[PDB]
C-alpha cells in the first residue's frame, strides 16, 4: 500500500501527528476538512496511550469507546462542540453509517465497527494495525 500507511511511515508528522493514523493527519491526507470522526477515532486508536478511551477489540476493524460520551466530547471539541454527548457523536456516526464507514454495534459497550474496511483507504491491515497499537480491548 502507498496510502496513509507508508505516508505516516515516512512522515507521521502531518497535523495530528501522534498515533499511527493521526486524526488531522488523515484528515489532511484525504481532505475531509476540519477532521473526520473515523480519522479522529483512528488517532486515538492508533495511539497506544490515547487508545485508552477507545480501544480496538483485537482483530478486524472494530473499536470500543471507554468513555464514549467523553469520546463524543473529543469529537465535538474539535468541531466547537465541547459538550458533545454520545448522541451528537452518534449523529456524526450516522453520517458515516450512511457512507458505510461506521455501524454503531449496539449491545456491546459503545462498539463501532468499520463497515467500510479501512484497508483500502489506509492500507494498514486490521490485525497489524491494532497490533502495533498495543490494543487493550478491555475498557477500564
UniProtKB/Swiss-Prot annotation:
UniProt modification remark: Ubiquitinated; which induces proteasomal degradation.
Compartments where found: Nucleus; Cytoplasm
Ranges for region Helix HI-2: 23-30
Helix H5, as annotated region: 126-132
Region (Helix HI-1) residue spans: 4-12
Residues in the DNA-binding region annotation: 35-115
Region (Helix H4): 118-122
PTM sites of type N6-acetyllysine: 5
Protein purpose: Transcription factor. Directly controls the expression of cytokine and chemokine genes in a wide variety of different cellular contexts. May control the differentiation, survival and proliferation of lymphoid cells. May also regulate angiogenesis through regulation of expression of genes controlling endothelial cell migration and invasion.
Assembly and interaction partners: Binds DNA as a homodimer; homodimerization is required for transcription activation. Interacts with MAF and MAFB. Interacts with PAX5; the interaction alters DNA-binding properties. Interacts with DAXX. Interacts with UBE2I. Interacts with SP100; the interaction is direct and modulates ETS1 transcriptional activity.
Family: Belongs to the ETS family.
Protein name (Swiss-Prot/TrEMBL): Protein C-ets-1
Gene: Ets1
Residues of the full protein shown: 301 to 440 of 440
Amino acid at each position: 500500500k502507498g496510502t496513509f500507511k507508508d505516508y505516516v511511515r515516512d512522515r507521521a508528522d502531518l497535523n495530528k501527528d501522534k498515533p499511527v493514523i493521526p486524526a488531522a493527519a488523515l484528515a489532511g491526507y484525504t481532505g475531509s476538512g476540519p477532521i473526520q470522526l473515523w480519522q479522529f477515532l483512528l488517532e486515538l486508536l492508533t495511539d497506544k496511550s490515547c487508545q485508552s478511551f477507545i480501544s480496538w477489540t483485537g482483530d478486524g476493524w472494530e473499536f470500543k469507546l471507554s468513555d464514549p460520551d467523553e469520546v463524543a466530547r473529543r469529537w465535538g471539541k474539535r468541531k466547537n462542540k465541547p459538550k458533545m454527548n454520545y448522541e451528537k457523536l452518534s449523529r456524526g456516526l450516522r453520517y458515516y453509517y450512511d457512507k458505510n464507514i461506521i455501524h454503531k454495534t449496539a449491545g456491546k459497550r459503545y462498539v463501532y465497527r468499520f463497515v467500510s474496511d479501512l484497508q483500502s483507504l489506509l492500507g494498514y491491515t486490521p490485525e497489524e494495525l491494532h497490533a502495533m497499537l498495543d490494543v487493550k480491548p478491555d475498557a477500564d
